[PDB]
Amino acid sequence: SQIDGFVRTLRARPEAGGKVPVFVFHPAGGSTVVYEPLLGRLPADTPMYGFERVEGSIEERAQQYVPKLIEMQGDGPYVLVGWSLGGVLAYACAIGLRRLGKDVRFVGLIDAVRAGEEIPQTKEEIRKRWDRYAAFAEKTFNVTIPAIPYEQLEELDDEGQVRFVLDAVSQSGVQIPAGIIEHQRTSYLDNRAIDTAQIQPYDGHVTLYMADRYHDDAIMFEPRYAVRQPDGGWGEYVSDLEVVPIGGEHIQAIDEPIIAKVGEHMSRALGQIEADRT
Ligand SMILES: O=c1oc2cc(O)ccc2c2oc3ccc(O)c(CN4CCCCC4)c3c12
């Protein structure tokens, strides 16, 4: 995998012609190398490019990706796919591309499932979330995370909360590798980017590959992900939603054997698109 800006080449397209590329978008706290199992289950010579992390709200991230998508693929067709946060990013790009008159053929959400219940916007919720992260950081890094004063919780947005903790961490003098600090920073913000995403309507085909449940660690961070709606929270927004059950838990959906089901279904979709453009 070669990287150029925020674009990872997972399989380069031929010099000219060839099949429609699959554009995959990174998950919360990971890179697009996670899509290599999927690529192994897609038709031979299917190109694939991964869009890695950029800063901003979902819409601001899409505003950086959509111009690059068009630079690479022009009028279309567009195949946009993502697990975790990448599914929301793929969906946001599909909306932007459609608004610009581009040809989007397939949006693939790999268990990018909304919380079954609205997350309240209270200091109590912010507190519990940061204490759950403090517990995660102890079980994981055996490190003590500082806590934000209760009456300052609603004075800090997500970025500001993370900045507060990172500074107080370095001011506390705990030894944490910077590489872990940066992975933790992006994982926290990207998980919150899923939490706070506002889904816009999309008049187009979307396939939701739906696992059985979020895994325990996800539910420990935010228990409202223990509940799932049958449409994963997407039915009110998508005119043509196809829900493909894949079993397993959210963390397993990206890897074998669960990804074989995703690849088998997506390969048929890709074969139809290739036939349709020929
Ligand atoms: O799940 C997580 O893993 C992490 C793994 C890390 O290394 C670091 C941070 C986090 C992390 O910070 C979060 C903040 C809010 C929050 O709601 C969640 C739950 N997440 C929401 C999106 C859907 C799956 C569950 C997290 C979450």
TrEMBL record:
This is Polyketide synthase Pks13 (Termination polyketide synthase). The gene is pks.
